[PDB]
Design a protein that fits this description.
Length: about 450
């Protein structure tokens, strides 16, 4: 049952205002036929245009909300809206384009999807709140058939060209006019009461209804993300490597070890309260400190309230004001003044970070993590952590071409001595690259106000 059976029933109540008289009893087989597509009984990788909620969740990077509003249905113009903010007007003769015939509109659709998706996914998933016109408009820009490969590479085909009779992936589709073998999901099939806006607005205040098709497309995709990644969570689903995932994750582990080790050396905290991932390991295994762990799964809806994290019911809590607290990707409303924090900035633009629900973002790196909206007021008791590199390892090369390093932030015995050694220069430069990688991916670092790297120099005596 990996794919959605074409013989599964499709509820048609949402379709009956654009398509009055539509049968209540309807399969995806008959719906696709009504839409003008012929599947011809084919076992060539495309069994159904529509997919299950589970298949959609695995292909969240391909999600594009899509809505169509009958501007005036063959005799009248249609407004095509996408979750990219684009509105196109197709004449039968928040970016708003003037009315144009389908032969030119379809070229723009292929260009927009290709630029949006080439670095995200091998396909497109149109996320719908289906009322009828969107389904009947698909024949004007979509072609279907057997699964194919690109004419210029090994990737699966996503576009077709009537000018050359060739197929292309999102990277090689310049000049292509048809979307080929797209997928789609109707959010209305999941069991909702009331219209799109009333359901969307229950969970999100960031997407207004500016009464255009793209606004509905944005709300539809937002509602879908809420249902699949906010109220329901699945960290076992794996997602392919599309960018700097491995380098980012490795940089995160390096930065965490560096920052925590320096905080412990600089302020000599007797206890560290590590709050977050129930599977966390000590990031500084050699530290003398009393290491205490507290379990909190990643919050996907609202940031944790610090009052609830330290609420111990009918028993006394641990002394959280003693020592230091470590919140490594544990999103809280207001960090305590004695903290070391790594907080993902949801506003960051990247191929790993997708738009989410209520200001939040869906960060997809190995697993999908819906993250609550970044809020500067969470850090009022802390300061931004400045870049620095610290090392107590011996000054010896072991085993690249050199230019001598001069830097006030290379905290080593050799720099204290007046001249940074080759080993520490190489490690400083590698660390700086890892640091820049993590920051540019969207992570932000915050620390208790008394943190001072000047206190690290006396660890070399
Ligand atoms: C610093 N945090 C804590 O000590 C606690 C947090 N929760 C939820 C507790 C439950 C029972 C006992 C202690 C705690
Ligand atoms: Zn290609
Ligand atoms: Zn929304
Ligand atoms: Zn050195």
């Amino acid at each position: 049952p990996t794919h959605l059976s074409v013989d599964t029933k499709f509820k048609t109540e949402g379709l009956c205002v654009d398509i009055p008289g539509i049968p209540k009893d309807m399969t995806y087989r008959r719906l696709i036929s009504m839409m003008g597509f012929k599947m011809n009984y084919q076992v060539n990788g495309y069994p159904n245009m529509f997919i299950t909620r589970e298949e959609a969740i695995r292909h969240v990077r391909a999600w594009i909300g899509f809505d169509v509003e009958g501007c005036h249905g063959t005799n009248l113009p249609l407004q095509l809206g996408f979750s990219t903010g684009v509105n196109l007007v197709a004449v039968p003769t928040p970016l708003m384009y003037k009315g144009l015939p389908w032969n030119v509109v379809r070229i723009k659709i292929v260009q927009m999807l290709s630029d949006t998706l080439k670095n995200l996914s091998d396909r497109v998933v149109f996320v719908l709140w289906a009322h009828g016109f969107e389904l009947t408009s698909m024949k004007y820009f979509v072609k279907i058939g057997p699964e194919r490969t690109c004419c210029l590479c090994d990737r699966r085909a996503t576009c077709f060209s009537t000018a050359s009779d060739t197929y292309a992936c999102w990277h090689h589709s310049i000049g292509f006019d048809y979307v080929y073998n797209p997928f789609m999901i109707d959010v209305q099939q999941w069991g909702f009461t009331g219209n799109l806006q009333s359901n969307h607005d229950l969970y999100c205040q960031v997407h207004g209804n500016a009464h255009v098709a793209s606004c509905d497309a944005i709300m539809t995709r937002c509602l879908a993300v809420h249902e699949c990644f906010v109220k329901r969570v699945d960290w076992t689903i794996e997602y392919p490597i599309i960018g700097d995932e491995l380098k980012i994750n490795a940089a995160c582990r390096k930065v965490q070890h560096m920052v925590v080790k320096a905080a412990l050396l600089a302020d000599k905290f007797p206890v560290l309260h590590d709050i977050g991932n129930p599977k966390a390991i000590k990031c500084v295994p050699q530290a003398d400190v009393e290491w205490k762990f507290y379990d909190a799964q990643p919050c996907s809806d609202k940031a944790y309230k610090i009052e609830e994290l330290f609420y111990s019911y009918a028993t006394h809590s641990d002394k959280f004001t003693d020592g230091v607290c470590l919140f490594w990707n544990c999103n809280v409303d207001r960090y305590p003044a004695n903290s070391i924090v790594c907080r993902f900035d949801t506003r960051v633009l990247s191929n790993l970070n997708l738009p989410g629900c209520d200001g939040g973002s869906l960060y997809v790196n190995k697993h999908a993590f819906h993250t609550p909206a970044f809020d500067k007021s969470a850090f009022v008791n802390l300061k931004q952590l400045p870049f620095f590199y610290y090392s107590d390892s011996p000054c010896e090369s072991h085993g690249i071409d050199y230019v001598p390093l001069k830097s006030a932030t290379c905290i080593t015995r050799c720099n204290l001595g007046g001249a940074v050694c080759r080993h520490h220069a190489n490690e400083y430069r590698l660390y700086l690259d890892a640091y820049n990688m993590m920051i540019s991916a969207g992570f932000s670092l915050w620390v208790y106000k008394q943190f001072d790297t000047y206190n690290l120099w006396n660890t070399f005596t």
